[PDB]
């Protein structure tokens, strides 16, 4: 057998919370290509549909970060410098959640 999918590389120089939403949201835009990698394996019916359905929940969850950008004006990088002990972990779970949503949905996608 063979395999050629799922890779993680490159990083940014900011708070682990900001790196987690930045990487998670940037990798969500990349994970939309992982739907195409998997479409060649599940290639039965929803091959061009489930790529768009998991893009539908991906782009909808991406929109939730747009609301967090307005929260960032209430919660500037002042308390977040110390809250990072739990906020950088909770946003680190957002990047990992974005992957175990759309990457794990990729491995959980069904054939029809």
UniProtKB/Swiss-Prot annotation:
Annotated GO biological processes are: protein homotrimerization
Here the disulfide bonds are none
Q: In which tissues is this gene expressed?
A: Midgut and hindgut contents as well as fecal pellets (at protein level).
Q: Which UniProt keywords apply?
A: Allergen, Coiled coil, Signal
The answer, when asked if Signal is one of the entry's keywords, is: yes
Glycosyltransferase keyword on record: no
Q: Look up the coiled coil feature and give its residue ranges.
A: 1-91
Top-rank taxon: Eukaryota
Q: Name one GO molecular function term.
A: protein homodimerization activity
How would you summarize the oligomeric state and partners of this protein? May exist as homodimer and homotrimer.
Q: Describe the family membership recorded for this protein in Swiss-Prot or TrEMBL.
A: Belongs to the mite group 5 allergen family.
What protein is this chain from?
Answer: Mite allergen Blo t 5
Q: What is the lineage of its organism?
A: Eukaryota, Metazoa, Ecdysozoa, Arthropoda, Chelicerata
- In the UniProt record, the gene name given for this protein reads BLOT5
Question: What fragment of the full-length protein is this?
Answer: 23 to 134 of 134
């Amino acid at each position: 057998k063979k395999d050629d999918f799922r890779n993680e590389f490159d990083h940014l120089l900011i708070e682990q919370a900001n790196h987690a939403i930045e990487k998670g949201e940037h990798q969500l835009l990349y994970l939309q290509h992982q739907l195409d990698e998997l479409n060649e394996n599940k290639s039965k019916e929803l091959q061009e549909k489930i790529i768009r359905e998991l893009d539908v929940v991906c782009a909808m969850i991406e929109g939730a970060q747009g609301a967090l950008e307005r929260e960032l004006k209430r919660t500037d990088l002042n308390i977040l410098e110390r809250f990072n002990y739990e906020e950088a972990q909770t946003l680190s779970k957002i990047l990992l959640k974005d992957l175990k949503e759309t990457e794990q949905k990729v491995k959980d996608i069904q054939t029809q």
